[PDB]
Amino acid sequence: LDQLRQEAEQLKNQIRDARKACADATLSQITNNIDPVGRIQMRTRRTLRGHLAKIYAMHWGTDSRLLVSASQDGKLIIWDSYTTNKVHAIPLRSSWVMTCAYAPSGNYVACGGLDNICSIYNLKTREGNVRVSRELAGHTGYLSCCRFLDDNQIVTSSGDTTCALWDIETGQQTTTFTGHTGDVMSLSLAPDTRLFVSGACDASAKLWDVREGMCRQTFTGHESDINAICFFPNGNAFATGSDDATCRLFDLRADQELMTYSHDNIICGITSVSFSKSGRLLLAGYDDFNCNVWDALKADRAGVLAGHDNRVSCLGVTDDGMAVATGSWDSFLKIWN
């Protein structure tokens, strides 16, 4: 007991020393001699209307024009961003949704929330309607995020401090990921879908191996709940957004934090983060109704997207990098270039 606690303390000190040994130069010092991005100014190219309550989640399809949005009016709406047309409107059995996912093949969507269920809907039927294809029920807390690996595997994070890899066909948990002490709020798959990171309310981020179900690394530099997490397009770094009014960047191989994105006049929490196509820009949504575009190498506010009258709940960059979608509690979606 006490001896085990002392040994754990010594292991923590050893890990801290090994990480401090690798800290030879700062990312700011390395990038101090590059051209600043400049002033990034985007305009609302599209406005999507049709949700009657707060929007909690959106996710781009892989074709970069179809997106899915989830709202507490019990509605899962699929939008054609080019024409602003609505392709599908899925009536949810439970209206308390907090996350939605688009399958990479575009044949399925998923959602979940306070019902603790991850529901998978099939978009490609014989008669062209959408019916519930599967319901995943093993979680004992609210579903905060979910991401498809393929048409038959999906990873979910839950408020029960647990993540889970589900086989859709059988409906069982293929794998369970444990080790967080707080509610897991966000989830981000690596581009190769071999690893994934998760942020939780314990002010900690964890890297998990999908095949072996083990926590490879733990990153702790935030002082409050981590609300959002995103993978750098390299797959060797990730960004976390917390409600300590700070975004942070962590490197897998360096196994520590590189950059802290914060400003004196920014005190609200971060709800969502995403990277631009090249990873040079880091877009973050905030409680104060605005989105901020940071230079991911110099940690400077490149731009501001201010077009929402309520909290920016979600955001997402297209796969081709051409557009960014923001979804807010004011029930509107906006597409910016």
């Binding site: 049709g50 009657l52 009016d73 019990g74 509605k75 306070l114 019902d115 609210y142 309310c201 709940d225």
Partner: protein
């Protein structure tokens, strides 16, 4: 323009009209948030009327949807804002818990845990102007327990005699003194038991009073 584009536009228009019809249907619903520390009679209240339980019932042509989130044992502040905009919060407290310690002792009273939960929900930033219907359940069992054992176990600074009427009045005073938004919200307190059949009437009266007072505030008369 193109045939496919026209078909897409017509599909979108049909979806829009279905969405507005669903919104019109759902707007004619009174949303209630049901809370309480542990099992203090929620199930009894629901009978009288996954992770979240929805109970729909129509009383005097007025439709109510009540959402119970008791089984959601997680960080409440991560989802409590999801219920911003409900007409009222129904908070259930067991009067008999003034002597019971807890599920695990932890030297903390069940009544004190209920008071802390009530304080947090009542003074929550998301419910500054949301009214609370405070149900005080198990009044018969409380009367027996106060006949047998004193209330001083829960409230050491108690001076009244050990009788149900003033014991219950003191408990209600303690619960209602936790409201800091006395000029923005009201607490409708009702003592209930298992055999009571007027709880739905009490909820209906409190909800109609809330609606009328909101309309008065809008007209500048409240």
């Amino acid at each position: 323009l193109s045939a496919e584009d026209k078909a897409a536009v017509e599909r979108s228009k049909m979806i829009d009209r279905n969405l507005r019809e669903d919104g019109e249907k759902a707007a004619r619903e009174v949303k209630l948030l049901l809370l309480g520390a542990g099992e203090s009679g929620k199930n009894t209240i629901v009978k009288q009327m996954t992770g979240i339980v929805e109970t729909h019932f129509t009383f005097k042509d007025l439709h109510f949807k009540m959402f119970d989130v008791g089984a959601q044992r997680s960080e409440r502040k991560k989802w409590i804002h999801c219920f911003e905009g409900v007409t009222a919060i129904i908070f259930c407290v067991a009067l008999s818990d003034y002597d019971l310690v807890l599920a695990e002792d932890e030297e903390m009273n069940r009544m004190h845990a209920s008071m802390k939960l009530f304080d947090s929900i009542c003074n929550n930033k998301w419910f500054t102007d949301t009214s609370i219907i405070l149900f005080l359940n198990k009044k018969d069992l409380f009367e027996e327990k106060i006949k047998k054992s004193p209330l001083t176990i829960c409230y050491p600074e108690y001076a009244g005699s050990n009788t149900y009427e003033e014991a219950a009045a003191y408990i209600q005073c303690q619960f209602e003194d936790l409201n800091k938004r006395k000029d923005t919200k009201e607490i409708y307190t009702h003592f209930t038991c298992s055999t009571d059949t007027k709880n739905v009437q009490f909820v209906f009266d409190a909800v109609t009073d809330v609606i009328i007072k909101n309309n008065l505030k809008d007209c500048g008369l409240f």
